[PDB]
Amino acid sequence: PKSMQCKVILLDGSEYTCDVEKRSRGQVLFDKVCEHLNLLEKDYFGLTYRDAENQKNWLDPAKEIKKQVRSGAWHFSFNVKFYPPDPAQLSEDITRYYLCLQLRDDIVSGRLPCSFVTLALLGSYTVQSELGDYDPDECGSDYISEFRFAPNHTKELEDKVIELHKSHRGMTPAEAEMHFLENAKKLSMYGVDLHHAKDSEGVEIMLGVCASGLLIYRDRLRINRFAWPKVLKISYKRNNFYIKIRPGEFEQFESTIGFKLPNHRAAKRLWKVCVEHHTFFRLL
Ligand SMILES: CCS(=O)(=O)Nc1ccccc1F
Numbered sequence: 001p002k003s004m005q006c007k008v009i010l011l012d013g014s015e016y017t018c019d020v021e022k023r024s025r026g027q028v029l030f031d032k033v034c035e036h037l038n039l040l041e042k043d044y045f046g047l048t049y050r051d052a053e054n055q056k057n058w059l060d061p062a063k064e065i066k067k068q069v070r071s072g073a074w075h076f077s078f079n080v081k082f083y084p085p086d087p088a089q090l091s092e093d094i095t096r097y098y099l100c101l102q103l104r105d106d107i108v109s110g111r112l113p114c115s116f117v118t119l120a121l122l123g124s125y126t127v128q129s130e131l132g133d134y135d136p137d138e139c140g141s142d143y144i145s146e147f148r149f150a151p152n153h154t155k156e157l158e159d160k161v162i163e164l165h166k167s168h169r170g171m172t173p174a175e176a177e178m179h180f181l182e183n184a185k186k187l188s189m190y191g192v193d194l195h196h197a198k199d200s201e202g203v204e205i206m207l208g209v210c211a212s213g214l215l216i217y218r219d220r221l222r223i224n225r226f227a228w229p230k231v232l233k234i235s236y237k238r239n240n241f242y243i244k245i246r247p248g249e250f251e252q253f254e255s256t257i258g259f260k261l262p263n264h265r266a267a268k269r270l271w272k273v274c275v276e277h278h279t280f281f282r283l284l
Contacts, residue, residue, distance in 0.1 A: 004065070008033050008047065009077040011101035016078075020065065027061035033078055041095040043280075046081035057269060058276075082280045083191025085211045087181040093174040100126070100177050103184045110151040112189050120157055123149035124164030125180035129173040134166045193277075195270045197241070198260040207241075207259065209273050211281040214243060216257075228281055234274045236267040243274075 003019040006029050010016055016036055020028045026047065034042045047059040049069050059068055059076060080102040087096055104126060106112035107119065114122065126147055131138075144158050168176060184190060192208040192215065199205050199218070208215035214231065216224040226245060232254065233244035239262070245255040261267040 004074050006032075006065075006074045006076065009075075010037070011078060011098055011105065022066060024065050025062060026059040026065055026068065029065060029076070030059070030061050037078070037098065038094060039098060041090055041092055044080055044082045044084060044090075044095065045098065046079060047076040048079050049076050051265065053263075053265065055265070055269065058273070080191075082277070083211065085185060085191070085284065087185060088178065093177065096174070096177050096181055100129070100180050100184075103180070103190075104148070108148045108151060111194075112184075112187055114150070114187060116157065116160070118183060118187065119150045120160035121164055121183055122180055123147060123157070123161040124168060125171075125176040125183075127161060127165045128168040128171045129176040129180070132173075133169050133171075134162070193273055195266070195273075196262060197270075200258050202260070205259070207270065209270070209277050211277070211284055214274065228278050228284070231274075231278065234271055234278065236261075236264075236271040239264055239267055241267045241270050 002022045004022045004024075006018050006020060008016040008018075008029075010033075016033060018029070018032050018036075020032070030042070030045075030047055033047065034040075034045070039045065046061070048056045049059055050072065051057050052071060057068070058081060059065065065074065080099055084090060084099070087099055090096055090099070103112065103122075107114055107122065123145070126149070127145065130147070139162055143162060144153075144155075145161065147161075149161060150157055171179075189208075190210075192210045194217075195207045195209070197205050197207050199216075203218070206215075206217040208217065213225055213227040216226075218224070226243065230246045231243055232246060233242075235242045239260055241259045241261055243257050245257060247254055261270060
């Protein structure tokens with residue numbers, strides 16, 4: 001039996017190495033990574049790989065790894081796929097821990113925009129979780145944390161993290177992580193997967209995919225939202241992605257909204273993430 005070496009970037013930034021039989025389905029590797037991580041609430045997570053265009057794709061657990069990575073390296077990242085709207089409802093602290101690590105990368109990367117005060121509050125919970133109670137002996141008037149809190153660090157931001165860290169004395173890691181999540185879950189881009197597209201007139205929009213449905217970001221003013229229940233059919237054809245928007249009460253016919261994606265693979269990727277979000281968050 002021939003085995004392939006897999007490398008997986010974990011959410012703490014470290015590399016897990018393992019081997020799977022070369023005809024393995026994605027679930028085989030995913031199960032190995034989740035066992036390594038002592039993760040039981042696996043449904044919220046997945047592996048990503050980079051395709052031949054260098055685009056992030058979800059590894060399909062049901063399909064052969066080799067038919068997905070094709071010509072590319074067997075290199076992956078472990079990521080949150082379905083961001084829970086109610087992380088308090090997760091059954092395990094270790095699940096909430098991995099969710100915090102993902103969100104910290106979401107913030108530092110700038111995928112999850114955040115006000116100054118929320119950057120400092122989220123940072124102060126991370127510090128409390130990881131160092132425990134504020135100690136002045138480690139931090140002088142000039143202190144700068146090893147922790148990455150933001151896309152752009154300022155001394156003002158560092159000072160505000162420490163001011164809020166002082167307020168969290170006696171807070172346990174599980175408690176600070178839950179507070180982190182209670183704040184993060186309210187951010188307008190929490191759990192939003194963004195896809196570049198053009199509307200039916202060629203105007204450049206973003207389509208966001210999340211628990212509450214499909215969002216269409218046009219021009220700061222008027223952001224159109226389609227709750228999942230209001231979506232009967234999701235389809236793609238060539239470079240185009242279509243949704244069927246239900247007939248309102250007393251309306252005779254469904255309506256159709258079409259989008260142009262960069263290329264055929266981008267249209268298919270958006271369709272698959274929409275179907276998966278619809279399936280996952282159906283009874284939300
Ligand atoms: C931990 C639960 S959650 O992910 O916040 N919300 C949810 C998601 C899918 C179905 C039902 C649900 F309640």
